[PDB]
């Protein structure tokens, strides 16, 4: 068994990838699936559309895999990775879903999060699970279910209702659900840490957290928290083209990005660009709570005698959206490619700074009364300067989050891996290297998030045996940007950014 | 004699206009002439190019005037109006110019103005003449001449050198220069007040001011300060098509704009739009020094037993230039017409505010460490909002100067007349009415600056006999905008502007 499969069940799409030993994808398949928004701010998904989109991705990829004369036999194991926090409720005895899945960006729980943060008990939660209380974690979402849908009310107190993030849903159904000879209702530590039901230092459940939400361990059926890489806690695929192939890896998606970039040491960090950014920062083997609003979480739990590695996480709202703003709202250019050309048509930012706080700023500034704000404008300011400033703003925010991650962890920043969206822009990554003063790593193999789950599964089954093995194996079969700007001029820019942030406070009244 | 001529000798052009009794121009002619800039920041004009461009404008207009069967006989008098402060030196005995004319925006005197403001004596000058010491007034310019050109050094202490602003130069040469039977070397009070050599409360020379510059009344020949409207202190045209036609009016150009808009009462003000704005504010019959950096000056001196009427003046740097910035630097639109269309494609400014302090802000904020600054930006901000914000910014600055003019004068603002440039935009004038809460008057007859000099000449010669006569006469043969916005919402905008100004302080370091 030489190949490793990976399920990547995302927020808008599912894909299934088959990598070889060098970590290059050989067959693949991707499905954009249906996302339901009942009323504004509500975000739902049919749980069978997520399972079927994955299973159809397996079917199609295995079609192509077959075309190269390879079979089920060539795939030793598969890993799952999934959008996090999204919340699935099913009948623990029938396997049927008891209501739609509530996706992480859903805000229907906004009215409620007031009540629970209103309960004074609620602020040693942060050092218990790692997470500020949001509309985001699945705990708040599950609670809203057990108090607004009757089938969930009923099933719950009948000892009948099972819960899990998307990972555990997927693993349960792929093993055959309730009909399996060994029903698998498990979750990995990274997914588990996003619920607010698990204790970060334990990697198991904490009854104070279960208590605050009023979640009873004996009427709700909760997945056994297992490692992210285990040779048999995830069972095997029951049906389909991959019948009998064991599932040996499971990771929340952002952690799987970091694993797939081989950021196994403290100080190694990854950034994933889309409309905004997901920053993940490896902080080694003891949890680190954050002074700065960052989330503490599990990076990966590879078991096999080894300790779980934790991480800090921050997010940016306006990355790709700043580009989109220049295109749609100013008509600078039609496509991202040529906004990026605009930015390079000038030598520097001409003194322009663009605080892109369209919806305020988040980690680590936490300014809610700024709007987007553009400084440094003169008759000599051109489209190019603004375009460069807009790129630079995501670099400044990335650096601000990375700096905050240093002060929380005590580990020097060592490297920044990047993937997705804006990371395609040569100037923007070069500017990250200059501003942050470390090398910025951009792989050319496009599916690093799926690669992470493959890595966890390959380790549980011996495709790779050490993790020093893994980075060396994937490297076989531009890409790295180095700081060229002198540090003096690299620090006037960042201080010019911090002044600007300062000066954007208190705009709205 | 039924028609009135007007010379309008401007900064880039000269024109000559013939109005009828209703104040409508019947013939006209305009010459863009040569402007010389020896080295950067230096701005020179050959004095004979200004005189010849005027005389050629007379020749061409009289050609057309003749074509309608009218002659020299039909023109009872003419008025001069001219760019102010621009400085002419000529041999008091030969009439020949002793060096080029130094135009008002010339900054070669920058090195010097330090020395003279460095002389502690120099800050009861402001309440003596009305003027902050700038590179602008002709006093500083004349001094630089008498210390850097030898012909001026020589002619000066030989008792031979004569001086005058462009008005007096023009009047002297048109009367025949030194060859005249009655040489006319006169200036009107408004022009006189721009020199810093005249006492504002006297309307004559003050020897403390002459002293500080070291200007000796007996080696320099200075024009007799005369009224702006006098039936014989300006003599007559000697040569040309208008030979024998008396010159009976003379006004500095910005004052002539206000006269031509019929702002004869206190609280009536005019704004003239170009790249920036020239605001003039009638403050009645006693001078008013300014707490706020505004210039105190003579509005008009119509003599004939009547007291001289004074004014306050402020300027804005970025009016038309804000439009130009959107066109050239952002590519919003190709022409001003359609920047204005952009601004109307939206209902309001979408919360955007654009502090257009490209070179800082001047009256009355005096902020030198701001650059242009754009607030209120969200993903919903469109080109239209910014375009509206850019228009609104000149309205806010106009209102800030008008408000400062109220607090300096104690006279309520009563009306704002407008001409030139941006005043053509229906939205921008409507927005001035809403913001300022008074009616904004935009004539359709395009040459109000030339009209002012005609009015002064018509009064000295009885074409009109009262000034109540004048506004009623010109009105015969849109145009007025009224405040439509409720005052509540008109004052949130202006306070939102003042916050933004506040928040732009201290950008540059």
Residue numbers in the entry:
A (entry chain A), B (entry chain A): 65 to 541, 551 to 582
Authors' text:
Overall, the CtGK polypeptide chain can be divided into two distinct domains classified by Pfam as FGGY_N (residues 65–325) and FGGY_C (residues 331–583) connected by a flexible region. A similar case is found in CtGK, which forms extended dimers via the interaction between the C-terminal domains with a prominent contribution from hydrophobic residues (Phe422, Gly436, Phe389, Leu394, Thr437, Phe439, Gly440, Ile441, Thr437, Thr445, Leu438, Ile450, Trp580).
Subsequently, by replacing the cryoprotectant solution with 20–25% glycerol, we were able to solve the enzyme-substrate complex with a clear electron density that could be attributed to the bound glycerol moiety. In total, three different crystal structures were obtained in the presence of glycerol, constituting 13 polypeptide chains. Generally, the same extent of the chain could be modeled as in the apo structures, i.e., for residues 65–583 with an approximate 9aa gap between H18 and B18. The substrate is bound in an evolutionarily conserved cleft within the N-terminal domain that opens towards the C-terminal domain. The glycerol molecule is coordinated by polar interactions with side chains of Glu149, Arg 148, Asp317, Gln318, and additionally with Arg148 main-chain amide. The carbon chain of glycerol packs against hydrophobic Trp168 and Phe342. A similar mode of binding was described previously for P. falciparum GK, where Phe271 and Tyr135 undergo shift upon substrate or cofactor binding. However, the movement of equivalent residues (Phe342 and Tyr200) was not observed in either of the presented CtGK complexes. Of note, we solved and refined five CtGK structures, and each of them belongs to a different space group, despite crystals having grown in the same buffer condition. We observed that in the absence of nucleotide, CtGK adopts open conformation, which upon nucleotide binding closes up.
